[PDB]
Copies of this chain bind each other. A is one copy, B any other.
Amino acid sequence: RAENMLWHKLPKSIYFRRGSLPIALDEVITDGHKRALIVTDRFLFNNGYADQITSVLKAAGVETEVFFEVEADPTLSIVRKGAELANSFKPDVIIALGGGSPMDAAKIMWVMYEHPETHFEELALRFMDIRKRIYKFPKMGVKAKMIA
């Protein structure tokens, strides 16, 4: 009977303040990052909620594309076509937008883009609860990284 050990795992950096997006986004420009794609929902794009991130990116100069089809609940059909757009673009940074649905689906797009050969249904029985530590995920972040 081996005693179980806990953990405290978090993202490397968390930025927060009134108007902290452009300054945090700038750091990314200074680092080597040429290609990036943005995952978004529908309601906010018709508003002025998409130019505040694209315009600051175009001024420095980077290839950004529009992904405007994610609805309230991802249905494994738009994440597949998102991966199809991902490996047809070869991005270096994945930037998620929206709360809930478009940020949960961006993680799956990241896995399927970084491991095209691995089927989704293989991950449905190996990794479904964060309490086991006997099976390891294939290493990630090799050719992309996630901004939330």
Contacts and interface: CB of A to CB of B under 8 A. Distances in A.
Interface of A: 2-10, 12-20, 23-24, 30-31, 133, 136, 139
26 contacts: A3-B17, A3-B18, A3-B19, A4-B17, A5-B15, A5-B16, A5-B17, A5-B18, A5-B19, A5-B23, A5-B24, A6-B15, A6-B16, A6-B17, A7-B13, A7-B15, A7-B16, A8-B15, A8-B16, A9-B14, A10-B10, A10-B12, A12-B12, A23-B133, A31-B136, A31-B139
Nearest to A9: B13
A123 to B, nearest CB: 19
A114 B120 CA distance: 38
Contacts of A19: 3, 5
A16 B20 CA distance: 32
A16 B9 CA distance: 11
Given A3-B17, A5-B19, 20 more contacts: A2-B23, A4-B17, A5-B15, A5-B17, A5-B18, A5-B20, A6-B17, A7-B14, A7-B15, A8-B13, A8-B15, A9-B12, A9-B14, A10-B10, A10-B12, A12-B12, A23-B133, A30-B136, A31-B136, A31-B139
